[PDB]
Amino acid sequence: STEEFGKILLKVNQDGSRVLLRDVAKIELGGENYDIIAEFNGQPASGL
């Protein structure tokens, strides 16, 4: 889940403050690639 990835621990600072992955990046499910976008009669779609 994105929640589990977001709390990946990158490092701990000297003051004990924790740097988590979600502190340097946005975490979301998204396409392996974003190159293909299809429409069926003008409406968003997928297909095979």
Add this chain to the structure above:
Amino acid sequence: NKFQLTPVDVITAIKAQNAQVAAGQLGGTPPVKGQQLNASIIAQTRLT
């Protein structure tokens, strides 16, 4: 030996300085809408 080097150093340097390196694209997907140009980035390529 004069320069305190060995064949290990030679091999490491050749592998680093004669190599193909993947980069990416300018304006690649998913883009910021309004992007006007999409182009491949070419980085290190093999010596000739």
Add this chain to the structure above:
Amino acid sequence: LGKKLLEAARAGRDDEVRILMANGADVNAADVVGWTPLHLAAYWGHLEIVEVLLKNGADVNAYDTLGSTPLHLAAHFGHLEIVEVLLKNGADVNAKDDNGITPLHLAANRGHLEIVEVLLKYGADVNAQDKFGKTAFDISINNGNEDLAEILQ
């Protein structure tokens, strides 16, 4: 004897459990990892067998070979009704396993808000630390569970 009951409690067989205790089977029988019929019923979410087991004198604070109680299991796996029943019948709300982990830690980690409230209701030490110095609040912050974080303040 008890093995019959350990299995019947796991499978969730309400009748069998009754018949086996009418025959005088040990209700605190332990399997190879120290789990009692109450551990299994709590883990797999069989509330009826939990009640019928406690009614027959099931040790509600039994602990396995790593120190976890049926309340650890029920809280961890989101079995609200079983948590209440266990607590109603004298379950140590602050029980620590060998890692210093409490049912509140486990409920907090899985974001079972309703179960957290019940545990606090029965007097769960919000400041209890595990072997790594972590509280249920530390868990809620690390997980980013806003709803839970405020409940612990």
